[PDB]
Write an enzyme that holds these catalytic residues in place. Structure first.
Site, mmCIF file in Angstrom:
data_model
loop_
_atom_site.group_PDB
_atom_site.id
_atom_site.type_symbol
_atom_site.label_atom_id
_atom_site.label_comp_id
_atom_site.label_asym_id
_atom_site.label_seq_id
_atom_site.Cartn_x
_atom_site.Cartn_y
_atom_site.Cartn_z
ATOM 1 N N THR A 146 0.810 -1.205 0.000
ATOM 2 C CA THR A 146 0.000 0.000 0.000
ATOM 3 C C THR A 146 0.852 1.267 0.000
ATOM 4 O O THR A 146 0.358 2.315 -0.421
ATOM 5 C CB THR A 146 -0.989 0.029 1.175
ATOM 6 N N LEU A 154 -3.167 4.902 -0.382
ATOM 7 C CA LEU A 154 -4.561 4.531 -0.231
ATOM 8 C C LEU A 154 -4.595 3.033 0.054
ATOM 9 O O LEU A 154 -4.418 2.226 -0.853
ATOM 10 C CB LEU A 154 -5.319 4.916 -1.508
ATOM 11 N N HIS A 155 -4.814 2.683 1.325
ATOM 12 C CA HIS A 155 -4.495 1.371 1.854
ATOM 13 C C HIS A 155 -5.619 0.371 1.588
ATOM 14 O O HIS A 155 -5.436 -0.625 0.874
ATOM 15 C CB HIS A 155 -4.267 1.445 3.369
ATOM 16 N N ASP A 156 -6.786 0.650 2.170
ATOM 17 C CA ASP A 156 -7.807 -0.370 2.381
ATOM 18 C C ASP A 156 -8.394 -0.905 1.065
ATOM 19 O O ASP A 156 -8.628 -2.110 0.967
ATOM 20 C CB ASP A 156 -8.856 0.156 3.360
#
Ligand SMILES: [Ca+2]
Ligand SMILES: [Ca+2]
Ligand SMILES: [Ca+2]
Ligand SMILES: [Ca+2]
Lengths: 331, 335, 339, 334
Positions: free
Chosen positions: D210, D260-262
């Site tokens: 990420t 932008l991880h999720d």
């Protein structure tokens, strides 16, 4: 103006390079070498320190002490997969061994022979150096820090007069022998933790953050040959054994040369970034003992951390190192 | 006669133990090393020397000053049982002023006491260990830091050492913490190292035994009976010392009569026949937040002997031994 | 004034005695029983709770919930060496099982059958009780405290309205199943630790300190016969064989001549607190120790805010008051069972 | 189309992930459960509902409010990345005022939201797990307390659950602590329980991946290109949300462009072909004083899949997927 210092190490191919740099550098005046457990048993690292010295024709000048055989409160853990059974694989030492002068430390200690060497022998020597220092006495440490911790349990009042420059730890990158920790810390985390609480002036001069950017490339090998071949047809095979094993174990194309960078810091600190901070050493974690955890990214500061060389630093390091290897070849 | 060394943190109990060990014909005390615990190791050094000088032996027995703190923990003094000096209840100014030179300085070739270093005793003990036919006997009644330090330096000597200790609690709860005893909990890592080292280790005098070994009023009168006729001043000194120790134990733990812990360890070496004994595996808690120093047993290979109880007769045998020595010291000190 | 309460337990021979005392005591009004892992799997302790109730002719009155099968963050550990494989060794239950009424809890839950029972079933029941309480709702806990910890993770705002009376811990004596800790704590130390931080009004009513002094002697056996034989010889046989199975095992494992009866003392505390010494203090539960997890560590040898009451001793008279209460209930159950 | 459930702590990343998962044709979101983390679980509940209402789905997808604290530790909010509300950068007052009733209340037979309880989602999930042909898919991008709580209640369901998570760091260091990632370190015992439970567990989106998935200027212009023509206000909102997230990440960690991880977790379930993957044994540090939540690997039987990198092409595939969803939402909002 030349700096009195002592080396604590676990040779070890990196440690061998570090001894060469420190002993032949004009900036440093090495008073003694103490060996520790780590890579190999402390008996082997003792032998390997002596071998290094004899190769560079100094085994009759520098005293070598044989320190503690295990961590304060944990079991020993050798690193033979990087360094071999002997701790200095890749060369035949049988000649270097047979022609080995008596160890000057036996004379300081008043010992008939090596069978009388004891882990705490170096204490009184170091205490004299610490007493004589105008400000602080300089130790370069590139193995487990058991010896120094043992010393400070015996001479706690000497902590405030000691400056330690270490190859240890990892801060902004992950570990080597365990996921998030570096070999030297994780073999005796309690030792380093004691030191950081003792009042010692402690510098992480050469974490993996720096040393993983200091690789023995093919260009470096040719510069060594250029500086040494004309004077003395060993050092190459030693760095190559160190190359094969680092490829085998960690898939590095070119192996990092860790320990000399610590000595380089004492020689030439201007090439290093530096920051003061609080370092906590993990001692309780099941899988994370020896992690160097910092407040940088409000407990008082207990250390300096060097995260990077200034640009120019890599070349300055190799120049220094090639020069010393040149001088040794002449001798 | 049994060659031995004493490791201790005097301490009023430790003082009693030194008297018993030095004057017992069955023992031959080679040296005393002092440790942190009750007080700073510098104070326990002083207090060991005072004890020896009181009993007119400060010129015979070498006294080493050992380590000032645990391996991996902070020091923790016990001044609420023992006072600021470590030996409250008496004026030592005379015993101090008339103090012979420490024989250890001669062994070491030292000008004065300021050169004493924690690891000084190592070479001495190694010679004793080497000379032993079977094993060399150490009696330990403080923190076991010194012995752990020694075995980090001389690990090959572990198999030739026999340790007889006042430490731990097994079938009853602790003193300074709920489930642990002072000597273990001030350096749990030390004892843990020792039990892993190959040492022949005996818990000769846990709280299980020593809490049943109280300085009652009957004991005080038997001391007077054995000592007053020979040395009234010694009677005054020893009584005031056990009384200081009495007031504090009442104050802190609500004991009517205080336990006399450390001599029981020496008694074990003198007279082991009076002790119950069992072999077992002892684990020392080092990880617990509130329970470090707990002695946990499987009652894993055996690594220790535990003495849980004196045989019936044992208490009387102990006091007889102890009163006799106090009598002999009174004779020597004189009128 | 009769006291509404719930029982959390792991029957278990002691737990069986405790259920009898609580259900038949006029001072108590048992709203439900939830079972937990411990002595046996929670499915066995569920069954054993129901058996107890059916023996005393109440299995159709008191709802029994089947709670959590394992600790919050540790592996389960059964105690079959005190209690047997069934959890209630020493008698044949085959009749008591065959004649077993439907569990009232199924009705509260709206479940067709037992296969739908889930660990958190009791939550909404307990929340109603907690809401309805004028001051605090009383729980008697004599197994692992997993269920209550699970509950307070779900309903944290209810902690301040719960009063727990527990058989747990050892303070001034050593442990049973481990050197310095008692079974109920050491099987889920994190649970009790959560509870003591939650705001619950927590009482160590019956540590080993007390219960090791509460032994089924020969005098106790004869008083049971005196109170029960005239009404129900078979119940006399059953209750005695149950305490005797419990006797043989305690002699075998710990060398007790007469076995302690632990769990009822907790219920006795709610019935009759005047017979107990009591002190407020801070209890720390060891969760980090390798060999000492579940130790109940306090300041109490010597002379952080209080988070518990500890009962270290019965007042003199207390033992006889306990047995009187206990033998009376066993008498009443004998009357109801009949010949 | 793949039936799944989302567990999350919105959270700006979590909001992006909900958008991708709900509007992706490949996925069929059965429910959303919220957890403690970024904010209190009551705030993340609210933020999940807001996300759904923004994208005109708050009347379709049930939202459960899960557990408010870890199994055995104290809660720890992350307001320094996400703000006080958990979704800083925009005014939600309209989205709130026009908020439909939560379908979960209907499933549960509850009068109003005040009756929501942490374990409400259990029976819902158990039905899904029972109905699954092989395993039921959960996407987790917050603390894993809820799932651990579930498996303490329904331990036999572990073998029929497949988890795809944004959690952990393996070959790089941590964020909120030196060597550990937020989601793990807020409830290490939870994840440790899960990895021992028999769950099919994938670290689909550690920091390893990420931190290479940054909201650059090029990404911002592609968002405008896809959304402005349909819904200027949605463009303003999504941009302000990623900008709030940008300012904070620069402030705290000195990132030029924020990761932008999720959504990458959801992307893994949509499109696993773009991910490198390896099986290994992961130990979660629970005992360490300063290292709890570290994901330590043997890189002991395998208990997880770890995705260390996207295949080349993977970044573009991710953004294409993500811009498309944002486009479709803009069409619907108008
Ligand atoms: Ca080295
Ligand atoms: Ca002592
Ligand atoms: Ca029970
Ligand atoms: Ca999240």
């Amino acid at each position: 103006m030349s700096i009195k210092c002592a080396l604590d190490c676990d040779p070890g191919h990196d440690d061998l390079a570090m001894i060469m740099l420190a002993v032949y550098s004009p900036k440093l005046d090495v008073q003694y070498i103490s060996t520790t457990h780590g890579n190999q048993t402390v008996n082997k690292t003792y032998q390997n320190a002596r071998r290094t010295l004899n190769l560079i024709k100094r085994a009759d000048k520098i005293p070598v002490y044989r320190g503690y055989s295990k961590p304060l409160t944990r079991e020993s853990v050798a690193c033979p997969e990087i360094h071999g059974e002997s701790g200095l694989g890749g060369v035949d030492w049988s000649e270097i061994d047979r022609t080995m002068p008596r160890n000057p430390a036996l004379d300081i200690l008043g010992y008939k022979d090596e069978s009388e060497l004891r882990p705490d022998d170096f204490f009184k020597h170091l205490h004299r150096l610490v007493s004589a220092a105008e400000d602080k006495f300089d130790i370069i440490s590139t193995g487990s820090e058991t010896n120094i911790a043992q010393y400070l349990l015996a001479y706690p009042e000497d902590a405030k007069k000691i400056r330690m420059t270490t190859m240890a730890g990892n801060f902004m990158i992950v570990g080597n022998i365990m996921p998030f920790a570096e070999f030297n810390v994780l073999i005796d985390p309690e030792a380093i933790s004691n030191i950081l609480q003792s009042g010692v002036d402690y510098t992480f001069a050469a974490p993996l953050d720096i040393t993983h950017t200091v690789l023995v490339t093919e260009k470096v090998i040719n510069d060594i040959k250029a500086a040494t071949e004309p004077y003395s047809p060993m050092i190459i095979k030693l760095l190559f054994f160190f190359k094969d094993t680092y490829r085998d174990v960690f898939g590095f194309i070119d192996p990092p040369l860790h320990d000399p960078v610590a000595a380089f810091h004492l020689i030439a600190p201007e090439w290093f970034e530096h920051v003061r901070c609080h370092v906590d050493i993990e001692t309780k974690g099941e899988y994370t003992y020896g992690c160097c955890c910092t407040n940088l990214i409000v407990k008082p500061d207990n250390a300096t951390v060097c995260l990077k060389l200034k640009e120019g630093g890599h070349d300055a390091f190799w120049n220094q190192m090639i020069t010393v290897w040149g001088e040794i070849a002449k001798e």
